[PDB]
């Protein structure tokens, strides 16, 4: 005896409300927003000992 299954149909009211939720959260995050280290010469690169030589 297998049980129910949720539906994936989106019922337009929900996608309108989600758009509004996100449009509000974006403003709130923009408002809270008001309050490099270069990773180097990575290994496994075989010809890495040549980049050390263009310096001088």
């Amino acid at each position: 005896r297998v049980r129910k299954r949720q539906s994936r149909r989106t019922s337009t009211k929900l996608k309108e409300g989600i758009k509004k939720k996100a449009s509000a959260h974006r403003k709130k995050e923009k408002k809270m927003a008001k309050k490099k280290k270069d990773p180097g010469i990575p290994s496994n690169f075989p010809y890495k000992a040549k980049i050390l030589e263009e310096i001088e």
Partner: peptide, 19 residues
């Protein structure tokens, strides 16, 4: 020297790290 290849690349790794 199947192992010696790896041995040489480890040493050159060490050289690069030192520099």
């Amino acid at each position: 020297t199947s192992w010696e290849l790896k041995k040489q690349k480890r040493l050159e790794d060490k050289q690069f790290k030192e520099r």
